[PDB]
Amino acid sequence: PGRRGSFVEMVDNLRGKSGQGYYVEMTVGSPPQTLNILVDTGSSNFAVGAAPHPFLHRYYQRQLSSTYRDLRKGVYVPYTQGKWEGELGTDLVSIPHGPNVTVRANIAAITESDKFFINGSNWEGILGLAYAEIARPDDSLEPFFDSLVKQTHVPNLFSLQLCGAGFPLNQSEVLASVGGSMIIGGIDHSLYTGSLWYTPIRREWYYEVIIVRVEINGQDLKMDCKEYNYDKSIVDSGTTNLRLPKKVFEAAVKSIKAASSTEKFPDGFWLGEQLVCWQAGTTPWNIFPVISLYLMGEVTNQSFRITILPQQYLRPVEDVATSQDDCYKFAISQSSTGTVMGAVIMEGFYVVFDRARKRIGFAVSACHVHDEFRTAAVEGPFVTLDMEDCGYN
Ligand SMILES: C[C@@H]1C[C@H]1CNC(=O)[C@@H]1C[C@H]1[C@]12CN(c3ncccn3)C[C@H]1CSC(N)=N2
């Protein structure tokens, strides 16, 4: 049967790119104040700029909202590479290109920050879509999606199609371009090809999953599978890169270098810091390997795999000269906090966050970048034993 798309009202509601984030339009307050909001599956707070900042063109003005409620409590969120801090309250919230509902939700009004807002990103706040366990300051602060489900008939599921262009976008192009879809309350069949395969959500905190096998061009990385999930593996639209635990990163980069050895790149490239450039149109995709992550299936002793191309893990960037060369950064990097399946991974796939059934679905994205010879893939099943043992305790 032909694939019908039954969520037209939400298709194409995102903008952005992997390096700066994908965002959706929201409104807060009465009368509605429009803000662009980063979709972040790796955190659980709805937090919006609420005071001037050099990188904000607008911000939430609580004094202008008749429906604002002050919770008279602060929240401070320091993290590895930045901080956000603010004041808790509630207000009415809508998603214009979302379900036709308005809900009362917690909002952290950000008053101070450090390397949080991104120059030219076009977003003014973040929508943490993960679970209450990791909400700040504590799990009593109900996340937005939990409020949405509790207050409306919206089904307890959302799905993301993040669409990488495969080439750089400036602020102008990125403002005019469709960056993907967030389907609130359903699955839109127009956004993917082939079958959806589901992996269990291991625990409802982050969107935690279990990786059971890794291959580079079909060659097994051959690590103890616990290494792949040390100390967790998560799906995080608020991270650019595929991030891998130190040991796994070292093994993966060794293998990717070996596969790509017909061309030599500086250390700075492999450290994700330095761009590589080729003459227009000549990027040698074929010398770079595909990468497969096998995920625990829903059936006992079954796994499936997702396969990405260099068109996913090489992130398009602009040159210093803004030349006609095609340039990229290596978007795989080291983690000390587990595997992070970030935006560059997610760009390969339509990802279904099936909270109701405690599972995450993957299918090949209708908007993934590929070439005439290779495409991204989601394939199964494989017989895989002792998969629970891959999880870290
Ligand atoms: C793809 C986009 C270009 C990337 C920029 N990403 C971001 O600015 C992300 C929103 C942030 C955070 C908000 N963070 C946090 N940690 C604990 C509790 C609440 N918030 C951590 C911080 C980094 S990782 C993450 N998923 N979310």
**Which neighbouring-strand residues pair with 197?**
362
CB 98 within 8 A of CB 36: no
ω into 289 cis (within 30 of 0): no
**Do the beta carbons of residue 336 and residue 246 sit within 8 Å?**
yes
**Resolution to 1 decimal, in Å?**
1.3
Contact between 156 and 65 under an 8 Å Cβ cutoff? The reply is no
User: Would residue 236 show up in a list of annotated catalytic residues for this protein?
Assistant: yes
Is residue 125 within 6 Å of ligand 1 at its C-beta? no
Is the domain spanning 22-154 CATH 3.30.70.890? The answer is no
Long-range contacts, 292-295 (Cβ 8 Å, 24+): 292/213, 292/214, 292/215, 292/216, 292/218, 292/377, 293/211, 293/213, 293/214, 293/341, 294/211, 294/212, 294/213, 294/214, 294/215, 294/382, 294/384, 295/197, 295/199, 295/209, 295/210, 295/211, 295/212, 295/362
Q: Whose CA is nearest to atom 9 of ligand 1?
A: 238
SS3 state of residue 345: helix
Q: Three-class SS of residue 373?
A: coil
Q: Find the DSSP H helices in 240-366.
A: 246-259, 267-270, 310-313, 343-346
The span from the CA of 9 to the CA of 37, in Å, is 18
- 22-154 against 155-393: fold identical: yes
Question: Which atom of ligand 1 is found nearest the CA of 40?
Answer: 26
Q: Where are the domains of the chain?
A: 22-154, 155-393
- Among candidate residues 91, 146, 188, 236, the one labeled active-site is 236
Residue 343: φ, ψ to 5° = -60, -40
Q: Is the CB of 45 under 6 A from ligand 1?
A: yes
Verify whether residue 40 is a known catalytic residue.
yes
Helix, strand, coil percentages for the chain (3-state, nearest 5): 15, 40, 45
Technique used? X-ray
Verify whether ligand 1 is closer than 6 Å to residue 208 (CB atom).
no
Residue-wise DSSP of 239-263: --SEEEEHHHHHHHHHHHHHHTTTS
Sole residue written with tokens 């279990």: 210
Buried residues in 193-204 as b, exposed as e (16+ CB within 10 A): beebbbbbbbee
Judge: domain 155-393, CATH 2.40.70.10.
Answer: yes
Q: Which atom of ligand 1 is nearest to the CA of 44?
A: 19
44: CA distance to ligand 1 center in Å? Answer: 10
